Amino acid sequence: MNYARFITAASAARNPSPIRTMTDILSRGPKSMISLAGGLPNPNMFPFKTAVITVENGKTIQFGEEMMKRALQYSPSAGIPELLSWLKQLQIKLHNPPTIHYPPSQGQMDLCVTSGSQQGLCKVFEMIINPGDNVLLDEPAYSGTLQSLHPLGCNIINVASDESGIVPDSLRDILSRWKPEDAKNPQKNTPKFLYTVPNGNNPTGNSLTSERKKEIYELARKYDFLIIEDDPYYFLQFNSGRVPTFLSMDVDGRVIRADSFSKIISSGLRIGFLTGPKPLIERVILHIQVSTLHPSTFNQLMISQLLHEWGEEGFMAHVDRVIDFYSNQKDAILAAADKWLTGLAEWHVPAAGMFLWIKVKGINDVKELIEEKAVKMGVLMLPGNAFYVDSSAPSPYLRASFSSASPEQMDVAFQVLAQLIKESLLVP
Amino acid sequence: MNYARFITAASAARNPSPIRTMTDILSRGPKSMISLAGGLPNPNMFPFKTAVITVENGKTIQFGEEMMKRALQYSPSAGIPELLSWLKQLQIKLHNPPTIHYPPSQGQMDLCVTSGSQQGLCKVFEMIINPGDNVLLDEPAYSGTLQSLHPLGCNIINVASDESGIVPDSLRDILSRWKPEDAKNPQKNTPKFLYTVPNGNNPTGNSLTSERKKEIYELARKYDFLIIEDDPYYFLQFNSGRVPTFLSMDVDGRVIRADSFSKIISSGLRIGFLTGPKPLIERVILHIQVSTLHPSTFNQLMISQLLHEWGEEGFMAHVDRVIDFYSNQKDAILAAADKWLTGLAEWHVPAAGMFLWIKVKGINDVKELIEEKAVKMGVLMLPGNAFYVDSSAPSPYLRASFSSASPEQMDVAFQVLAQLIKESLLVP
Ligand SMILES: COc1cc2c(cc1Cc1ccccc1)cc(NCc1c(COP(=O)(O)O)cnc(C)c1O)c(=O)n2O
Ligand SMILES: COc1cc2c(cc1Cc1ccccc1)cc(NCc1c(COP(=O)(O)O)cnc(C)c1O)c(=O)n2O
Numbered sequence: 097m098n099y100a101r102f103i104t105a106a107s108a109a110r111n112p113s114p115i116r117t118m119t120d121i122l123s124r125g126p127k128s129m130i131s132l133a134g135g136l137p138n139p140n141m142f143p144f145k146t147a148v149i150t151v152e153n154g155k156t157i158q159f160g161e162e163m164m165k166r167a168l169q170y171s172p173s174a175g176i177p178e179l180l181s182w183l184k185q186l187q188i189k190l191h192n193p194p195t196i197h198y199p200p201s202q203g204q205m206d207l208c209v210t211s212g213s214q215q216g217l218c219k220v221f222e223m224i225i226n227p228g229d230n231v232l233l234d235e236p237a238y239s240g241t242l243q244s245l246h247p248l249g250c251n252i253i254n255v256a257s258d259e260s261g262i263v264p265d266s267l268r269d270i271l272s273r274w275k276p277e278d279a280k281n282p283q284k285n286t287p288k289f290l291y292t293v294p295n296g297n298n299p300t301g302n303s304l305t306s307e308r309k310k311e312i313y314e315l316a317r318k319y320d321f322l323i324i325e326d327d328p329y330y331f332l333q334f335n336s337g338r339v340p341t342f343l344s345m346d347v348d349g350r351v352i353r354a355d356s357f358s359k360i361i362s363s364g365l366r367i368g369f370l371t372g373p374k375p376l377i378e379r380v381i382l383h384i385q386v387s388t389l390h391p392s393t394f395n396q397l398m399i400s401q402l403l404h405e406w407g408e409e410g411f412m413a414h415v416d417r418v419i420d421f422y423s424n425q426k427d428a429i430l431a432a433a434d435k436w437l438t439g440l441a442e443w444h445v446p447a448a449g450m451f452l453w454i455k456v457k458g459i460n461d462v463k464e465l466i467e468e469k470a471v472k473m474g475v476l477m478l479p480g481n482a483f484y485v486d487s488s489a490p491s492p493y494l495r496a497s498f499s500s501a502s503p504e505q506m507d508v509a510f511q512v513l514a515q516l517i518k519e520s521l522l523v524p
Numbered sequence: 525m526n527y528a529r530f531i532t533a534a535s536a537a538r539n540p541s542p543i544r545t546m547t548d549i550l551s552r553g554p555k556s557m558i559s560l561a562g563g564l565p566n567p568n569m570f571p572f573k574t575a576v577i578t579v580e581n582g583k584t585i586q587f588g589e590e591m592m593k594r595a596l597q598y599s600p601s602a603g604i605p606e607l608l609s610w611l612k613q614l615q616i617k618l619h620n621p622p623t624i625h626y627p628p629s630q631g632q633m634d635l636c637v638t639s640g641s642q643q644g645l646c647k648v649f650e651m652i653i654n655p656g657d658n659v660l661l662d663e664p665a666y667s668g669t670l671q672s673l674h675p676l677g678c679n680i681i682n683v684a685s686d687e688s689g690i691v692p693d694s695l696r697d698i699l700s701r702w703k704p705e706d707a708k709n710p711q712k713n714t715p716k717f718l719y720t721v722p723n724g725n726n727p728t729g730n731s732l733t734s735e736r737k738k739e740i741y742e743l744a745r746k747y748d749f750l751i752i753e754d755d756p757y758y759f760l761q762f763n764s765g766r767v768p769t770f771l772s773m774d775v776d777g778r779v780i781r782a783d784s785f786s787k788i789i790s791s792g793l794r795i796g797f798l799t800g801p802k803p804l805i806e807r808v809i810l811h812i813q814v815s816t817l818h819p820s821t822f823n824q825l826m827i828s829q830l831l832h833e834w835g836e837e838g839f840m841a842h843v844d845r846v847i848d849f850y851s852n853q854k855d856a857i858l859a860a861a862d863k864w865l866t867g868l869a870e871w872h873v874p875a876a877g878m879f880l881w882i883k884v885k886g887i888n889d890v891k892e893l894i895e896e897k898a899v900k901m902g903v904l905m906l907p908g909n910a911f912y913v914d915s916s917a918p919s920p921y922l923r924a925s926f927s928s929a930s931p932e933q934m935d936v937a938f939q940v941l942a943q944l945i946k947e948s949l950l951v952p
Contacts, residue, residue, distance in 0.1 A: 247538050
C-alpha cells in the first residue's frame, strides 16, 4: 500500500524534533552519560511532592517522590512506554490485527496515546484532507466529527443506514460513480476514507453486523480507501457478543482505529489511543509533538498503574460493571419513553452507547419544541439538526442521553415532551 | 482593529459546539432543571475515588469524592472557571493590559488554558498562516516554533539580533520594503506577525530592553502586524526585576501572549495559558474544542487549588525560589565554561532561561563534533543547526542546558568538549 495519497503536503513536510533525537541517545545510553541537551526543568522545583489516589475495588495508587518527579516531567509524544506496551497487548488480545509483524512501510501496527479519542480523529482528518476532497460517512453522525470536517473544506457524501448501521449496497452505489482504477489517479478525486462508528453510532445507537463489516472492508480494498473506525462504544455493547472490528480484519493495513477511555475510565483525564498503520500513526505523532508535545504524564501514570494492577481480566471485569450500569439506565429511559412517548414518537433500541434517538411522529422540525419550549420548561435534550452536515435542514429527531438521569427525572422529562408534542399537534 | 486579515478561511469557518450550546443553558441554571442533552458519562463508574497530593511549602491538596468526580469529568474548552479568573487577575496585577474593558469586537482581553504554551502557539500559527505568507522572527529561535512553522508553508524573515534581543533598526529596515498602507491590501503580502521570546530567548538567553520593546510595538502599530509574545522565561529572569511586556503596552489589542508553567509548576501536567484579543482567543478555543476538547480537568484542579491557597504573594515567593535555584545553576555552568572553554569558545551570559549559547572559536560546523564525537564520549549537547530555518547551513554554535546538571557533571562535560575542540583544530 501507498500512504502518500492519504497525507497532505503539510503533514508530509513534518519533521521529528532534532532535540528529542539527541535526547533519545541518552535513554539508549549508559548511566555514566552526561546530558546538557534537553531543556527539561529540574523537577525538584515543582511544588507537588507525592500523590495518593484511592481506587474503588483495587489497590490505592501511590506516587512517591521519584514517581511524582517523573509524573510532573515531560515524556514521549506517542505516550509513556508502560501505557503503550499494555495498550498494544490489549489490541492484540482483543483484535489480533494481521499487521502486527508487517514491515513499517507496508503499514505495521503502531499505537499512540492521544488527548482523548477526539485528538486522534482530528489529527487524522487534518493529515488526510485537502480542500475539495471527497469523504464518506453515515448521517446522522457525531457532531465533533462534523465540526472537525466542516473547516477542512471537504465534500461529505452520506452513505445510507438502517438499524444494522451502514447499508453496504448504498456504499456500493456511491462508489460505482468511480472505477477501482480511479483510486491510483488523484485528479479523478476518489474518496480518501470512510468514517464510521460501528458500535452504538452517535446519535442513533445502531451497530454494524459482522457480514456488513466484511462487505464494507472488501469495498475499501476495491476503491482503495481508508476506514476510520471510531469505536468509543466497543466496551459499551448491550446484549451482544463482541462483533469483530475493522482492525481485526485489516489484512491491507488500511484501518485507523480510535479507542476512548472517556466512558469507562475518565472523560476529564483526556486519555485515548489511536491504532493504525505505522506511516500514518507517525504523521499523527509529529502533529501532536508540535501541538500538545505529549499527553499528561501524570494522567498516563494514573491510568497505567490502574491498568497494570487490574490486568486484561480486571479491566474486563470493570468493563462488565460499567455495561451493567448503562444497561439499567437504557432500560429506565426505554420504560419512560414506553410510558409517555408511544403513539407520539418512534425509536429503535440502542445496541451500544448512552443515547436514544427519538423520531417525533407529526412534527417536521423539533428545533423550536426542544430549543425554545422544552428549555422554558426546564427539560434539556438535543435537536436532531446538530448531527447532520446541513444543520439548517429540518429534523424530526432528538437525542436523549441516559448516562446520568435518574428514572424519576426521565419520567418528568418525557411527560414534559409528550405534553409539548401534544401542544404542537393540538393547533387547528 | 480588523482581525479578519489574521484569521484563515478554515479558522473563520469554525463553529461552537451545538451540543455545548445546550450544555451551558443548564449552567444558567435552576436546580430544578433536568438534562438529557449532554454525553457526559456517569462519574460514579470511574475507578479513582479520592486524591491526596502533598505540596512543597503549602497545604495538602485533597480531592474528596465530589471534587474527584468533577476532576475526572469533562469541563469547558477555555478552562475551569477558577483557574481562568485567577489567571486573568494575575495578568491584570502583572501586566495591567489596556484592553481589559474594550468591546469584544475591538479586541478585549481574553484568556484560555492550553495544553502547554506549545498548544496555544501552534493553534495561533494555524489560525494566522496561509501558505506563502510572510512572518517575522529572530534566528536562532526555539525549535518547536520552527517545526510548527515549517509545515505551514510560510516565509520566515530573519530579523537581526544582539545581546539586547531583536535590533529595532533591523526590523525597521525589513519593513521599509512595504508602505504602512500595504497592511490594507492582502496582495501586498505585508508580514502577518512578529514572533518573539522577549526574555531569555531559546537558545541565546538574551532579553529585550523596555526601549527596544517600545520601538517594536510602534513598528507593529505602523505596519499593522500582531506580536506573538512567547514569554516562558518571564518568571525566570536573573538580576533584572521584570521589564514591561508587549501585553502591558497593548493599546491596540495586537499582542497574543503565551505563558508557561513548565519551568515553575510542571512540564508534564501540560498546563499553560494564552492571553490575547477576544476574537483571536475565540478562534483558538474553537480549534481546541475539536482537538483535545479541553485540558485535563484534574491537572487544572491541582494547579488552581495550589494557586488559590498560595495567592499572588505565595506564587511570587515560589517563583523567587525557582529563580534562586536557576541562578546558582547558571553560575555553575559559567564557572565550568570559564575553567575549560575560555580561549576555545565565546558566549554571552544569559539574562533569563536555562541555556548557555556557546560559539566555538575555529570551527565552521560543530555538527560532527557534537553529534558524532561528543556522543561517542558520553556528553550530550545540542548543535546550533537545530535553531535555524535552514538546518543544512553550518553553525559554529551549540546549546548547553544548565537546568539539571550538577556542577561536577558540567566540569566533566566542558573538559570533554574542550578536548574534542582541540582535536578538531588539529585536522588540516
Ligand atoms: C456536554 O458536553 C459534552 C458532550 C459530549 C461529549 C463531551 C462533552 C464535553 C465537552 C467539553 C468541552 C467542549 C466540548 C465538549 C462527548 C461525546 N462523545 C464522545 C465521542 C468521541 C470523543 O470522545 P473522547 O475525546 O472523550 O475520547 C469520539 N467519537 C464518538 C463517536 C463519541 O461519541 C458526546 O456525544 N457528547 O454529547
Ligand atoms: C528533551 O525534550 C524536551 C526538550 C525541550 C522542551 C520539552 C521537551 C520534552 C518533549 C517531549 C515530547 C516531545 C518534544 C519535547 C521544551 C523546551 N522549551 C519550552 C518552550 C516552549 C514550550 O513550553 P511548554 O509547552 O512546556 O509550555 C515554548 N516556547 C519556548 C520559547 C520554550 O523554550 C526546550 O527548549 N527543550 O529543549
